[PDB]
Design a protein around this ligand. Structure first.
Ligand SMILES: CC1(C)SCN(C(=O)[C@@H](O)[C@H](Cc2ccccc2)NC(=O)COc2c(F)cccc2F)[C@@H]1C(=O)N[C@H]1c2ccccc2C[C@H]1O
Lengths: 99, 99
């Protein structure tokens, strides 16, 4: 698809058996999702945004489905104001910026 | 151009006759740049991200070039961790997400 940027580029994702709305975010190195449960081992991590840093849980090898495209990658879980699909997963679905 | 997301989508911008590096950021509503001098009067603006909120100065109708594409619009100035080009100017340069 082609997604214009007149409003927030929000999509519906499937993750950990749950449906969530998330923002396609080219400024985010990684994917960060509001508090939820994910299977497997995790490591603490600090990520920095416009307002400074938040502490998150890093989960690796997590399957996500986004606009019919299934991808696998690292998902960070923590107190993010907005669910954000970052570059680590955007690449996998073949997402690019074009102008 | 087509810009893949394997690395940060960093581009050269020109603002106030000077060259700077900025991130093309679809998760940002607005464009925010590090401390610098811009002409005219400014008004107050709060912007929120991961980590919280920062106070910025809002300048309107500012000439700015992004990867050679000429735009004129709102530029925020303040303590941002990186220079960010947001949707307000991405739409001006005809930028879309494609996959
Ligand atoms: C969807 C959000 C609200 S949350 C993430 N986000 C964004 O715009 C995100 O792309 C940011 C961009 C950014 C990178 C580095 C420093 C500072 C900011 N990224 C982040 O918040 C975190 O990204 C990571 C990461 F997860 C891991 C490692 C490194 C990173 F940079 C949105 C936002 O803050 N946007 C606000 C914004 C930003 C600039 C100008 C105006 C405004 C208003 C809001 O729209």
């Amino acid at each position: 698809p082609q997604i214009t940027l007149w409003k927030r580029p929000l999509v519906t994702i499937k993750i950990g058996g749950q449906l969530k709305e998330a923002l396609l975010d080219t400024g985010a190195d990684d994917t960060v999702i509001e508090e939820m449960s994910l299977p497997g081992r995790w490591k603490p991590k600090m990520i920095g945004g416009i307002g400074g840093f938040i502490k998150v849980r890093q989960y690796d090898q997590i399957i996500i489905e986004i606009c019919g495209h299934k991808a696998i990658g690292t998902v960070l879980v923590g107190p993010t104001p907005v669910n954000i699909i970052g570059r680590n997963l955007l690449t996998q679905i073949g997402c690019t910026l074009n102008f």
